[PDB]
Amino acid sequence: KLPEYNQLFPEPWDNFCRPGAIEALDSPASYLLDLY
């Protein structure tokens, strides 16, 4: 209804991980894993 970011993009924030963590889809660890 009201105009706000999440209202425009309804999405559970819990469906995202914190940036910088190992859990990051682009963590340097993830890069290493891909390489491996």
Binding site: W13, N15, F16, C17, P19, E23, L25, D26
Partner: protein
């Protein structure tokens, strides 16, 4: 599936930018967050 999509950086960039300005306003600082006072010294 051990990873998840993280919050995309530009968003927190925005959040932080504004929060920084807000903080400077909290403490009467310049936009640069520098002290506005002359910080005089003596003994």
């Amino acid at each position: 599936d051990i990873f998840m999509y993280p919050m995309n950086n530009e968003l927190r960039g925005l959040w932080d930018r504004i929060e920084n300005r807000i903080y400077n306003l909290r403490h009467n600082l310049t936009l640069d967050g520098k002290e506005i006072n002359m910080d005089l010294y003596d003994s």
